[PDB]
Amino acid sequence: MRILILGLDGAGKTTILYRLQVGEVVTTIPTIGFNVETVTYKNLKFQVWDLGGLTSIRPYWRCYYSNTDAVIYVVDSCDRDRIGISKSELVAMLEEEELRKAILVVFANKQDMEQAMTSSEMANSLGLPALKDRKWQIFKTSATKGTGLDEAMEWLVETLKSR
Amino acid sequence: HMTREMRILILGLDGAGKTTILYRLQVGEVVTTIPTIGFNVETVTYKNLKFQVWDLGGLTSIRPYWRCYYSNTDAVIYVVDSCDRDRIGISKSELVAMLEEEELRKAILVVFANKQDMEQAMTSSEMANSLGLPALKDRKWQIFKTSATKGTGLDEAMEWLVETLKSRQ
Amino acid sequence: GEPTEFEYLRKVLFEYMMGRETKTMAKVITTVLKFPDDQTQKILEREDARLM
Amino acid sequence: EPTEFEYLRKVLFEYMMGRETKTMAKVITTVLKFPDDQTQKILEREDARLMSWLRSSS
Ligand SMILES: Nc1nc2c(ncn2[C@@H]2O[C@H](COP(=O)(O)OP(=O)(O)OP(=O)(O)O)[C@@H](O)[C@H]2O)c(=O)[nH]1
Numbered sequence: 001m002r003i004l005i006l007g008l009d010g011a012g013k014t015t016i017l018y019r020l021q022v023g024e025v026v027t028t029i030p031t032i033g034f035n036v037e038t039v040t041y042k043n044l045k046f047q048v049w050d051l052g053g054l055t056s057i058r059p060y061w062r063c064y065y066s067n068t069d070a071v072i073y074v075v076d077s078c079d080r081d082r083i084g085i086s087k088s089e090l091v092a093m094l095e096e097e098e099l100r101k102a103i104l105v106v107f108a109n110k111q112d113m114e115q116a117m118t119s120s121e122m123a124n125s126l127g128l129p130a131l132k133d134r135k136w137q138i139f140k141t142s143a144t145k146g147t148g149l150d151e152a153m154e155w156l157v158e159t160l161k162s163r
Numbered sequence: 164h165m166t167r168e169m170r171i172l173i174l175g176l177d178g179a180g181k182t183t184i185l186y187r188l189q190v191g192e193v194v195t196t197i198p199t200i201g202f203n204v205e206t207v208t209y210k211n212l213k214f215q216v217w218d219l220g221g222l223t224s225i226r227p228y229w230r231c232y233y234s235n236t237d238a239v240i241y242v243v244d245s246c247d248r249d250r251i252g253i254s255k256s257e258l259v260a261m262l263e264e265e266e267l268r269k270a271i272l273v274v275f276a277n278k279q280d281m282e283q284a285m286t287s288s289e290m291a292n293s294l295g296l297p298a299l300k301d302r303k304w305q306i307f308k309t310s311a312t313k314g315t316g317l318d319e320a321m322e323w324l325v326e327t328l329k330s331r332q
Numbered sequence: 333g334e335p336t337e338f339e340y341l342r343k344v345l346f347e348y349m350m351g352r353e354t355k356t357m358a359k360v361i362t363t364v365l366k367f368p369d370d371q372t373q374k375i376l377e378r379e380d381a382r383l384m
Numbered sequence: 385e386p387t388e389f390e391y392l393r394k395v396l397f398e399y400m401m402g403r404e405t406k407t408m409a410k411v412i413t414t415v416l417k418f419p420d421d422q423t424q425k426i427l428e429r430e431d432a433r434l435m436s437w438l439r440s441s442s
Pocket residue numbers: 007008009010011012013014015016028029030031032051052053054109110111112113141142143144145
């Protein structure tokens with residue numbers, strides 16, 4: 001199974017990847033390229049690609065779409081100004097024929113902060129209730145504390161197991 | 164080895180006439196050129212021998228890449244603009260640098276003092292001195308007056324290159 | 333400051349030249365470097381013809 | 385545009401089309417300032433491909 005972790009720079013992608021791999025917070029630098037690790041959940045192996053989200057390299061995301069079973073889309077819940085950007089990147093990517101059948105899980109990350117938007121605002125801003133022909137769910141996560149990850153991953157795995 | 168396809172590099176500063184020389188050798192005529200940001204490689208027939216000739220771009224920022232091409236080089240044609248008084252010292256230092264490379268130990272050096280059709284051209288002797296050629300003890304080398312546009316001197320320089328290659332120990 | 337495409341390409345080209353995920357890396361390279369569409373087609377057709 | 389992009393396209397096109405691949409691999413690793421450990425791994429691999437071609441009859 002092949003998973004892409006996408007989202008704007010600073011959203012917490014790389015921090016999520018190593019939290020999923022080794023249950024700990026790791027120090028990161030901006031990812032100018034990608035990280036790839038295989039992760040083991042409920043006796044099952046996923047190849048997870050963490051793609052850098054900086055402005056200049058976002059356009060290259062589509063190069064990696066072939067044979068993608070799921071996208072983990074990570075969104076900084078405190079970043080109200082750029083949720084519009086995340087939504088336009090999400091609309092653009094879900095028009096791609098290669099992701100026709102991909103499962104979409106949205107991680108509303110940095111929910112440990114008081115400044116966090118709620119799961120509900122975010123779904124509306126991202127246009128998620130309007131999405132058709134798509135299996136999707138949104139989850140509240142903090143990559144630093146660890147909350148919400150085990151439960152989002154339970155959902156992704158079971159959804160993938162069912163086609 | 165004379166029987167077999169041999170390898171020549173045409174090197175020198177931007178504007179020296181490298182690309183013009185390459186195509187005068189290959190097809191016998193002057194062609195229009197642009198600044199080579201990359202290289203041209205052509206099969207050149209001279210005295211019915213086959214040469215893989217690599218013409219490498221001479222812009223300052225891509226000169227560091229020349230050395231990537233030095234492996235298995237039989238000869239360097241080093242092209243120098245005989246009217247460029249300001250940069251003969253730069254031609255010198257690029258020459259000194261390449262001749263330190265071990266990949267080039269076996270290579271013969273032929274210097275084309277090019278653009279000798281021009282009125283203000285430096286003499287062959289002044290250029291040889293300026294480039295430090297007489298100091299190249301361990302290197303088989305010769306300098307020739309050439310014009311890529313008028314064709315003069317090319318055949319004599321190429322004849323020397325071929326005689327010298329045939330004479331290799 | 334070096335264009336950030338250089339760091340990006342170092343990672344992509346290392347992978348590609350070591351034979352890892354070559355079809356993906358070839359798409360990325362041809363995209364990052366803005367190859368004319370006809371060269372891209374030629375490169376990706378040859379990549380597809382690499383026999384396992 | 386960076387001068388290096390035009391240069392890299394010429395060089396990468398030859399490399400990806402299977403022409404003069406050793407030379408091109410040297411050029412690409414130099415232009416992009418690869419560390420010498422990775423460069424030697426890449427070049428060892430080119431040399432091994434050419435060794436496997438020279439020793440195979442078919
Ligand atoms: N408060 C809080 N900070 C987080 C959380 N997750 C990640 N961070 C921090 O957010 C910053 C950016 O995280 P990264 O994981 O490097 O972000 P990224 O999405 O991989 O960014 P790029 O590599 O540029 O695409 C780091 O300082 C993280 O420690 C979180 O859940 N809560």
